[PDB]
Amino acid sequence: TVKTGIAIGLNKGKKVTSMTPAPKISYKKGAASNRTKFVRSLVREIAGLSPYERRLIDLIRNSGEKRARKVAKKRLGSFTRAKAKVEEMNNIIAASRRH
Amino acid sequence: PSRFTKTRKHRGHVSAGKGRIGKHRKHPGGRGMAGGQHHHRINMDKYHPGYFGKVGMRYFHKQQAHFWKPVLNLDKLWTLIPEDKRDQYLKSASKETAPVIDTLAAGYGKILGKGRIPNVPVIVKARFVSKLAEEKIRAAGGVVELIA
Amino acid sequence: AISKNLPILKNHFRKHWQERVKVHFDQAGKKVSRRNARATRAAKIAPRPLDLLRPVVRAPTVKYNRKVRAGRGFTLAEVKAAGLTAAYARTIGIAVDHRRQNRNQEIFDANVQRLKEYQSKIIVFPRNGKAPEAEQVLSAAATFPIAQPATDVEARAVQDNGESAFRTLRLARSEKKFRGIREKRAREK
Amino acid sequence: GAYKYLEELQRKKQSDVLRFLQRVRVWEYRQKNVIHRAARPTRPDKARRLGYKAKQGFVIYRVRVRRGNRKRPVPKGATYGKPTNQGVNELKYQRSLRATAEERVGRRAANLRVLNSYWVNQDSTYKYFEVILVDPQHKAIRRDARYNWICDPVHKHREARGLTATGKKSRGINKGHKFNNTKAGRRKTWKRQNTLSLWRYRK
RNA sequence: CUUAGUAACGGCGAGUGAAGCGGCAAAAGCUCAAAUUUGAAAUCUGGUACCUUCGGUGCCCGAGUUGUAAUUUGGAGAGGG
RNA sequence: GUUCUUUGUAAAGUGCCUUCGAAGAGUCGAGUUGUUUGGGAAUGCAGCUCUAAGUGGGUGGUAAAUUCCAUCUAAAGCUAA
RNA sequence: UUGACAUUGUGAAG
Ligand SMILES: [Cl-]
Ligand SMILES: [Cl-]
Ligand SMILES: [Cl-]
Ligand SMILES: [Mg+2]
Ligand SMILES: [Mg+2]
Ligand SMILES: [Mg+2]
Ligand SMILES: [Mg+2]
Ligand SMILES: [Mg+2]
Ligand SMILES: [Mg+2]
Ligand SMILES: [Mg+2]
C-alpha cells in the first residue's frame, strides 16, 4: 500500500508517513448479534415459509439449483439476492428432511 | 452618449436610414439561427464550416480538474528563480551548488523544451516532462526529478 | 437572422428574464450592516476572539493537493493528543469535527502543535466570576496563521544515475496498461 | 422486550398467520367509515419508532384511500391543446396515497398536528393507513421538552406543505448528485438558476 | 464570485444546460426507536385547599405495564473489575 | 458589582482490563406505465405487479457475468446566522 | 370491447 512517488503508474502519488485511524463503529451496522440471531431463528419456526419459498424448494429438489436461481431472480430484484435466497433454501432443505 | 449617435442626425429624413423600398420590418429571414440549412446555407458553409453534425465520442460526467497540467517551456524556466538570485547562480555554474526549481509549486504540470537555457546545472522537479526537454537539461549538467 | 462573418452567439433570453433581474444596488448598504453586525456581536459575545480555531488540512484533487488551507475542525484523535476532551474543547473556542480522519502523520503533528500553541496563548477565566479585565482580540485566525510547509532547500548537488525521466514515465504508463492482459496470459499457462 | 419480536414478525407478510390476520382485519376496516378514530395502534412497535408515545395528547386515526391513477378531470376527454398533452388515462399523481391519507385526516382534526403515518392493509380498491396525531394544546405536550417543538406556529399543517416523512420523499429532499434538481426546493433552485445578477461595477 | 454558455440533452434542427473542486459571507450543534426500575411507575393531565401566581405545595380521582421517567444514538455506548 | 439561600452520603468528566455492542419492511431493491431532468440501456417523482438482506445495505454518471477496492449508514426527529 | 395479473379463499373429479 506504498505509493511509488511518481505522477503516474499503478500506485501513483506522493509518499507520506501513514497512520491507521481508529475503526468507526458505524462500519459494523450490518453485523449480526446474539440477540438478533435468536429472534430471527425463533420467528422463522413460528411464521413458516412464504408461498414463493415453497416453490423454490420444489425446484431445487426436482429441477436443480440452477433453475431455482433463475426463478428466484424474477421474484426478487438483483441476481445477487437470488443467490442468497437459494443458498438459504438449501440450509432449510438440509435440515427439514435430510436430517 | 445619445448626443453622438446617428439617430440625432437622422431627425427629419423620413426613413431614418433604413430605405424607402426595403423598409425596416420585424423579422425578415426568421429569428436566431433559423434557416441555417435552407436559406442561410451559403453563409454557414463559408465562415463556419463544420457546424452541422457530430464527430467524437461522448464523455459522461467530465471533470476538468483531472486534466489540469499547465505547460512551461525551457526558455521560461529561469524566470521561476527570483531575480535577486538569478545573477549569482548564472555566474556560479557548478556542481554541489545547483539551484533547485519546484515547478509544481509555481503551478505547472509538464516541462516542454522550446528555447535554449544557459549552460548551467539546474535541478528541476516536475510531474511530467517531454523527451526533448530532459535532454537539454542534462546537456547543461542538470537533472530532472519526478515528483507527485 | 444570419449574416456576415460573426461568431455564433448563445444568449439565453427566451424566457421572462426581466421578471427575475437582480441589481445589487445595496452593495454598499450590506457592507455597512455587516460591519455593524460584527461590531455588535463582538461587544455582546465575550472578550473572546469572535471566531473559532481551525486546523490545517490538505486540499483534495490532483489540481489543488499542493496547498494547505483551513479545514472544518480538529479530529477526535487530534483533540485527544493535545490533552483535552472534545466536549471541553468546544466550549473553549476550538472547532471539532468528528467525521474527518487522520491518515498523514505530518498533518496530524501540525494540528497537534496548533492546539498546544493555542492553549498557551489564552486565559480561561474561572467560573467563580472574578474575570480580571483583558483586552479583546478580534481575530484568532490572524493570531495563528496557516503557512505552507517547506519542501526543499534552495540548492543541492546534481545526482544523475543515468536513467531517463522520460523513459521512466513511459514504462510506468505502459506497465499499467498491460497488467491485466499479462496476468491473464500467465494464469492460462 | 417484545417489541423486537414484533418488528421481525411484521416482515413475514405472506406467512400463513399474517395472511389470516390481514384478511379478517381488512374486512373489519371496510365496514367502518372512511375516516374513524382508533382506540389504540394496531402496530404498537411501528408507532413507537415513528415518535408515538402512550400518553394523553397522542391520537391515532385510521383512513382508507382509493387506489389507481389520477384521471384528468376534463369533460369528455377533450384537452384543447397539442397532442403531447392529450393524455387522460395513464397519468399519475405526484403525491403518494399515504400523503393523501394524512391530508384528509388533518382537515378532519384541525386542532391537532400530524406527526407520522404507516401502512396497515390494502385491497384492490383501497389502501389503509394509520395517522399519528399530537394535541398542541394539551399540557402534557406543552410541558414536555421533547415534544413541545410541535406547538410552535411554524409547524401548523405539516402534511399540507409536505414536511412529513412522506412529504419530503415526494419533494426529493435528499443529498447527492441524484437530487440536483430538488436538493433545497425545486422551485427555489429554478429561480436561482434563472436569475440575471448585475453588480454596480459590471463584471 | 467562479466553474460555464462548459460536460451533457436536442426533427443532434431551432434551442436547452447543471455539478465536484477553488476564494468569500455566516458559522452550532444534536435526539428518539430498538435494553428488566423489577429490592419497589421512580412519570403525567385534571379537580380541590392554600401560598411567594407565565408557577409552587399538600390531598384526591384519573391516564398508563398493549410501557409513562432515569440511563444510551453510532462521533459511539453499555454491564461488571 | 453586591445580597439571600447550600443545592448534595447529588450530578458530571477522565485511565486500565474483560465480556458485549440491540441501530427503523409492502421499506430497500426489481419489472412495467406516465411524467420530469443536462442525466444519455433510463435524473427525480407517482400508479400497478413482484418483493429482500445482516461481515448486510446504498453509492462510485454505459447495459451484463466474475473477482477486488473506495466511501458513507437510508426507509424516524429538532435546530440560530 | 378482449386477454393477463391483483382483489382470491375452501372441496372433489376427469
Ligand atoms: Cl451625419
Ligand atoms: Cl421518532
Ligand atoms: Cl431511456
Ligand atoms: Mg437623403
Ligand atoms: Mg417609410
Ligand atoms: Mg430589406
Ligand atoms: Mg421588393
Ligand atoms: Mg427547459
Ligand atoms: Mg405534472
Ligand atoms: Mg426541519
Side-chain angles (χ1 to χ4, degrees), chain D residues 27 32 37 95 121 159 180 188:
Chain D
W27 169 89
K32 293 189 174 189
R37 173 72 181 269
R95 306 190 74 184
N121 211 323
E159 78 293 340
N180 287 337
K188 194 174 84 172

Side-chain angles (χ1 to χ4, degrees), chain A residues 1 3 9 19 26 36 42 57-58 68 81 86-87 91 94-95 99:
Chain A
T1 176
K3 295 183 177 302
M19 290 182 56
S26 55
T36 326
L42 190 65
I57 286 189
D58 308 330
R81 296 186 179 188
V86 172
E87 191 274 342
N91 291 325
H99 181 81

Side-chain angles (χ1 to χ4, degrees), chain B residues 13-93:
Chain B
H13 294 262
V14 182
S15 296
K18 307 300 178 180
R20 300 180 177 270
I21 308 169
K23 301 164 165 55
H24 189 183
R25 289 287 163 84
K26 305 304 296 299
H27 288 98
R31 295 202 189 191
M33 300 291 298
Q37 288 182 327
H38 303 80
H39 54 103
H40 295 139
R41 168 173 294 204
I42 298 183
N43 194 40
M44 288 278 93
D45 285 2
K46 73 180 299 185
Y47 299 147
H48 296 292
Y51 182 80
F52 294 104
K54 58 178 66 175
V55 184
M57 54 179 178
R58 296 166 297 169
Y59 189 145
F60 301 151
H61 184 44
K62 157 78 67 57
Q63 297 186 33
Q64 303 294 342
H66 297 177
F67 304 87
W68 179 84
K69 193 189 301 182
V71 297
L72 180 64
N73 283 319
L74 287 182
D75 59 2
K76 201 184 174 182
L77 185 64
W78 274 83
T79 61
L80 273 60
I81 298 180
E83 198 278 329
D84 66 327
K85 298 183 181 179
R86 299 174 193 172
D87 302 76
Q88 57 179 8
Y89 285 119
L90 287 176
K91 277 70 182 180
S92 303

Side-chain angles (χ1 to χ4, degrees), chain A residues 13-63:
Chain A
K14 184 178 180 299
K15 298 184 294 298
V16 304
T17 308
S18 298
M19 290 182 56
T20 299
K24 302 177 63 179
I25 191 60
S26 55
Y27 292 159
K28 296 178 173 298
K29 188 184 190 171
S33 65
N34 299 126
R35 182 186 312 184
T36 326
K37 286 182 296 182
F38 179 84
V39 174
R40 288 169 183 162
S41 67
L42 190 65
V43 173
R44 166 65 75 178
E45 301 303 320
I46 294 178
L49 274 65
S50 188
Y52 83 94
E53 294 177 333
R54 300 186 186 95
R55 289 192 289 267
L56 291 182
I57 286 189
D58 308 330
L59 290 177
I60 295 180
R61 297 175 178 175
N62 288 12
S63 188

Side-chain angles (χ1 to χ4, degrees), chain D residues 93 95-117 131-134 149-150 154-168 170-171:
Chain D
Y93 184 39
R95 306 190 74 184
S96 64
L97 300 177
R98 179 181 167 193
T100 302
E102 296 178 358
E103 294 268 17
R104 290 177 180 171
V105 172
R107 298 195 306 267
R108 177 67 170 274
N111 58 309
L112 308 180
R113 300 295 182 271
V114 176
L115 186 61
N116 264 324
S117 63
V131 184
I132 304 172
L133 301 164
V134 184
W149 64 268
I150 198 59
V154 82
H155 295 287
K156 289 186 295 192
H157 288 281
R158 299 166 76 250
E159 78 293 340
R161 294 172 290 155
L163 297 183
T164 58
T166 177
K168 301 174 74 65
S170 297
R171 291 164 60 202

